[PDB]
Design a protein around this ligand. Structure first.
Ligand SMILES: CCCCCCCCCCCCO[C@@H]1O[C@H](CO)[C@@H](O[C@H]2O[C@H](CO)[C@@H](O)[C@H](O)[C@H]2O)[C@H](O)[C@H]1O
Ligand SMILES: CCCCCCCCCCCCO[C@@H]1O[C@H](CO)[C@@H](O[C@H]2O[C@H](CO)[C@@H](O)[C@H](O)[C@H]2O)[C@H](O)[C@H]1O
Lengths: 148, 290, 95, 148, 49
């Protein structure tokens, strides 16, 4: 958070890209850095490779480059996951009375619906698109801070 | 704009529902503040039995209605035949700098490539997404009073940017505590000049830093470790796709300066890697049958 | 929270604290109504209609505990196409 | 199978990593399987003695290793030279003591003036028509900047 | 005297040994910055004194 696309492209993505390349049976890698401070690196493998082995190899390679990353990135942490292409359904959850906002609905879905919808047989993964989760936000007034 | 577009679209006889994502971009399914996507889902197959209720007619009518917005660029596309697969009619490639020249050089190379392609036959229209026209602010600090660079950077980092401090426990789970400046106090480019710092005395940044307006990109795409730009295209009508790659390579052999290379990315890369190696199966089957 | 002692300076009169979202930049709407969206993916080498039926059944089960102003909805299910295709196949065979 | 052994060794070393001293963990440790079969050796020389070992090895790293690694059937590619590039500072204790200065203070000073800066955007829950990113000067690149 | 063991150990480590401080970027890659004493000043056992 709070980073510029060139800064995240140079300081963050370069060590990870320099360390990750070298595993067996790759085709290419892609990295995307966005203005809000998000970095996404996707790596594809040749057809026939078991996803579990590829995920294990990628985890082993990314675990080595952690100490070279900045303190903020390490404190937040990076996450890796195998991609599931196929879709079977999408479902929306609504608030017709306009009594609840976006964040509350997203966190309500996270709290109890996703856990029950992740344990069925055959489900690969479920996503969530909307606002973020809950947090204690403090907004500062620089004038009052400088006054004291 | 997306709300108005959805309101306009939810009156068509053939449509059923519209889902909108104000703030999502189609280039890599990332987040952008100046882009939006709307999925429009139609009625069941039984109701739309008329000829004018087909998908193409709906798309044409929707585009005609959208062409009167005078506020944004609006386009309508059909679904892809297979999810997760790239375009199967055209082709795409990457122009990337091995020597790490810069952004302006890459943009000039892309423009020269587009000019050469439009000046040559056996190629149709070409598209790209490389943009360097996004405005932004640049702040410079001179070394001219007891103030430290670390403090003058930490104040800007914590006020304008977000800082993640500690955690807390609620609803049984763990969440984060973040600090940031108030919304009205950081909505103007001149608000950066009104912050204050220590040394013990209070001193504003009006006598320390200067701010100017510059231009740059918004998203950075890196391919195989080097900065790259995407080029889309397709064979011109009347010719096959085999000669298109040869023509592209021939023109790239001259229009590309030193330190710039091009590479196939999707589908075409796999077709080249596999090669023409499955042409023996028909003779083998004929011989076996005989 | 006490910050500086002199008179005591608290956090309330210097900054405004609240509970909100940790990330802004993505909004999702359905017919100009605030909502949330969740798509479900399959695991490789699984069944298509079974997971769909279990999803509908469990959503119906969970619908009983929902508050007054909260409801769910089914938007898109691309498992229908194969549902049609196999059906058509049988007809052909019979004919 | 070598993959299972490598995974087990990595899983074992990742558990014992935190007990190591600060310097070794900050520099990082590596683990990899061994390929006993060698197929070819290739040298790359400068007949005119215009370039030393370090530049030649770094050039081989930059432009040769990446193309060879992606080949089909290659297990690993070695490199026996003089090492990668680095920015070296040589100190004179007499001049350091002349200024009533200590080495640790010098290390602290150089560590604080060669860091990257993260700046938030302007007009990001705001009500401004425009949002503009902010960037500043971070890491140094040339020897003169380091000497200044 | 008021000297500390940590002070002399740190000075000896930085001068005679090595110290890896921060990183930088060049040619699109990340490299290290290291500190060490000049060679002619660490060539004899008496130089420690
Ligand atoms: C109701 C829920 C439905 C869930 C659907 C699942 C998500 C599907 C995402 C599909 C992603 C977009 O899919 C594909 O995107 C590419 C890339 O822009 C579009 O490709 C487009 O490229 C550019 C614009 O970007 C145009 O100049 C071009 O003419 C057009 O083809 C394709 O027309 C579309 O088929
Ligand atoms: C509510 C709906 C939310 C849907 C979110 C799930 C969609 C996930 C992405 O699903 C799919 O991913 C693939 C593989 O990266 C990408 O697929 C894309 O490939 C290439 C570019 O990479 C395009 O030329 C092509 O047209 C498109 O299919 C798109 O991003 C999307 O079609």
């Amino acid at each position: 958070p709070g980073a510029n696309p060139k800064v995240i492209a140079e300081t963050v993505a370069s060590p990870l890209e320099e360390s990750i390349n070298g595993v067996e049976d790759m085709l290419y890698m892609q990295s995307q850095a966005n203005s809000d401070g998000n970095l996404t690196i996707t790596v594809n493998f040749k057809l026939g490779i078991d996803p579990d082995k590829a995920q294990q190899l990628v985890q082993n390679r990314v675990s080595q480059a952690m100490p070279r990353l900045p303190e903020d990135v390490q404190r937040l942490g990076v996450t890796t996951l195998k991609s599931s292409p196929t879709l079977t359904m999408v479902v929306h959850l609504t608030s017709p009375d306009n009594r609840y906002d976006m964040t509350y609905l997203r966190n309500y879905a996270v709290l109890n619906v996703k856990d029950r919808l992740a344990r069925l047989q055959g489900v690969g993964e479920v996503g969530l698109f909307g606002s973020g989760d809950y947090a204690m936000r403090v907004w500062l007034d620089p004038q009052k801070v400088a006054q004291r | 704009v997306i709300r108005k577009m959805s309101d306009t679209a939810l009156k068509q006889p053939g449509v059923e529902s519209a889902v909108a994502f104000p703030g999502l971009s189609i280039n890599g399914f990332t987040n952008s503040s100046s882009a939006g996507i709307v999925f429009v889902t139609l009625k069941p197959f039984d109701e739309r039995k008329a000829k004018d209720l087909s998908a193409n007619a709906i798309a044409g009518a929707l585009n005609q209605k959208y062409s009167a917005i005078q506020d944004a660029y609006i386009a309508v596309f059909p679904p892809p035949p297979v999810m997760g697969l790239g375009t199967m009619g055209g082709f795409k490639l990457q122009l990337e700098d091995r020597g790490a020249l810069g952004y302006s050089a890459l943009n000039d190379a892309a423009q020269n490539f587009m000019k050469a392609a439009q000046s040559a036959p056996e190629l149709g229209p070409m598209f790209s997404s490389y943009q360097i026209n996004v405005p932004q602010l640049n702040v410079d600090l001179d070394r001219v009073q007891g103030v430290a660079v670390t403090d003058v950077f930490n104040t800007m980092q914590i006020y304008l940017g977000s800082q993640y401090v500690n955690d807390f426990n609620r609803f049984g789970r763990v969440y984060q505590v973040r600090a940031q400046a108030d919304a009205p106090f950081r909505a103007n480019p001149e608000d950066i000049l009104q912050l204050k710092t220590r040394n013990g005395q209070m001193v504003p940044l009006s006598s320390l830093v200067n701010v100017t307006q510059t231009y740059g990109p918004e998203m950075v795409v890196r391919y195989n470790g080097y900065t790259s730009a995407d080029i889309n295209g397709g064979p011109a009508p009347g010719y096959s796709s085999s000669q298109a790659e040869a023509a592209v390579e021939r023109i790239a052999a001259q229009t590309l300066p030193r330190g710039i290379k091009f590479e196939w990315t999707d589908l075409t890369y796999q077709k080249i890697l596999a090669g023409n190696a499955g042409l023996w199966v028909f003779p083998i089957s004929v011989l076996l049958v005989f | 929270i006490i910050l500086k002692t002199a008179a005591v300076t608290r956090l309330g009169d210097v900054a405004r604290v609240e509970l909100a979202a940790s990330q802004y930049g993505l909004r999702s709407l359905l017919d100009n109504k605030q909502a949330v969206a969740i798509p479900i993916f399959q695991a490789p080498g699984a069944n298509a209609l079974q997971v769909s039926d279990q999803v509908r059944s469990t959503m119906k089960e969970l619908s009983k505990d929902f508050p007054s102003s909260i409801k769910y909805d089914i938007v898109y299910d691309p498992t229908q196409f194969v549902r049609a295709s196999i059906k058509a196949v049988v007809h052909t065979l019979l004919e | 199978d070598p993959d299972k052994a490598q995974q087990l060794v990595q899983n074992r070393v990742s558990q014992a990593m935190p007990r190591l001293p600060e310097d070794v963990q900050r520099l990082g440790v590596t683990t990899l399987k061994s390929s006993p079969t060698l197929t070819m050796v290739v040298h790359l020389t400068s007949p005119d003695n215009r370039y030393d070992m370090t530049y030649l090895r770094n050039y081989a790293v930059l432009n040769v290793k990446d193309r060879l690694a992606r080949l089909q059937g290659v297990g690993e590619v070695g490199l026996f030279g003089s090492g990668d590039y680095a920015m070296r500072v040589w100190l004179d204790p007499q001049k350091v003591a002349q200024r009533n200065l200590t080495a640790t203070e010098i290390v602290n000073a150089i560590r604080e003036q060669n860091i990257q800066v993260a700046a938030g955007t302007i007009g990001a829950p705001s009500n401004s028509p425009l949002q503009l990113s902010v960037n500043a000067q971070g890491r140094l690149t040339t020897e003169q900047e380091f000497a200044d």
